[PDB]
Design an enzyme around this catalytic site. Structure first.
Site, PDB file in Angstrom:
ATOM      1  N   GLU A 139      -1.678  -0.893   2.314  1.00 41.07           N
ATOM      2  CA  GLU A 139      -0.451  -0.545   3.046  1.00 41.07           C
ATOM      3  C   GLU A 139      -0.840  -0.381   4.523  1.00 41.07           C
ATOM      4  OE1 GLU A 139       0.958   3.443   2.358  1.00 41.07           O
ATOM      5  OE2 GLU A 139       3.038   2.778   2.335  1.00 41.07           O
ATOM      6  N   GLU A 241      10.414   5.813   9.377  1.00 38.65           N
ATOM      7  CA  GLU A 241      10.188   6.708   8.241  1.00 38.65           C
ATOM      8  C   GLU A 241      10.375   8.147   8.714  1.00 38.65           C
ATOM      9  OE1 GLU A 241       6.498   6.181   6.096  1.00 38.65           O
ATOM     10  OE2 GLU A 241       6.918   7.804   4.711  1.00 38.65           O
TER      11      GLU A 241
END
Length: 274
Positions: A139, A241
């Site tokens: 990621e 986020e």
């Protein structure tokens, strides 16, 4: 060497200061990547069912570079909203050549996105041939900005206190030093379920709300540090986020484009209609 492109379709992020209107709204978890209508891009949202209310509006294929969006969150538990390239076709980053993102947004202020938050580029990649079994799935984040928290200003870069992991190195690109962090994750949610994977971060030392990101430069620096991405890039998207809190993100411009080493444009949005 790499020559940066010079093409009039590239929108100057310094002057992309106009609030956008219209577009398409989504307000639930998308269930992975969903293609956007008449666009080369896909979006993905996670909006947890704890009681928080979140929303995404994509500004459409014709304005703001084609990948521009706004979103809002009210008491989320880790709200994620991203839009950009979805690939996942067994090709390494280098297949996509030189990847750039021009951006300009406004957002709510410090302490409006909980204890941790991220703004910038995000994705995953798979490295099936990795010598370390922990490093088969990656990621990744290129962090341009964030909302800070009660201990740290949003105008100061986050560190390992937030991201977890270990500082690996630094490089300078697009007008700022970036600190490089690697974090091995054990038994955590991933695009392959709960498992062990690795996170790579570049954290921009001078956070900003507009400019251009030379995405491929980060990929190359990571690999130079032994932080391998492998032969299968999943996606390359612009992410907001928010850990918690109540805030907004509103892009005047998110423009992805790709060019060869001599600077010739390979893909850019919007596409011309007739």
């Amino acid at each position: 060497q790499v020559v940066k492109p010079t093409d009039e379709r590239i929108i100057d992020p310094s002057t992309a200061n106009t609030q956008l209107t219209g577009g398409v709204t989504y307000n639930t978890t998308s269930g992975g990547n969903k293609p956007l209508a008449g666009s080369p891009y896909g979006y993905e949202t996670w909006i947890d069912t704890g009681g928080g209310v979140c929303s995404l509006t994509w500004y459409g294929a014709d304005q703001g570079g084609g990948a521009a969006f706004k979103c809002t969150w009210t008491n989320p538990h880790d709200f994620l909203c991203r839009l950009g390239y979805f690939w996942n076709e067994n090709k390494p980053y280098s297949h996509y050549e030189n990847i750039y993102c021009g951006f300009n947004y406004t957002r709510s202020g410090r302490k409006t996105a909980g204890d941790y938050s991220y703004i910038g580029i995000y994705g995953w990649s798979r490295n099936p041939s990795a010598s370390n079994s922990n490093e088969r799935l990656i990621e990744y984040y290129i962090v341009e900005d964030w909302f800070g928290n009660q201990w740290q200003a949003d105008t100061s870069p986050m560190g390992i206190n937030t991201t977890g992991g270990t500082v690996m190195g630094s490089f300078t690109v697009d007008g700022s030093s970036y600190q490089i962090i690697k974090n091995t994750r054990v038994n955590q949610p991933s695009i392959e379920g709960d498992k062990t994977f690795v996170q790579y971060f570049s954290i921009r030392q001078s956070p900003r709300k507009s400019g251009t990101i030379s995405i491929t430069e980060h990929f190359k620096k990571w690999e130079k540090l032994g932080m391998k991405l492998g032969d299968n890039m999943y996606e390359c998207k612009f992410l907001i986020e928010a850990g918690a809190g109540e805030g907004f993100f509103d892009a005047r411009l998110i423009q992805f484009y790709r060019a060869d080493n001599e600077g010739n444009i390979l893909q850019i949005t919007p596409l011309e209609h007739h």
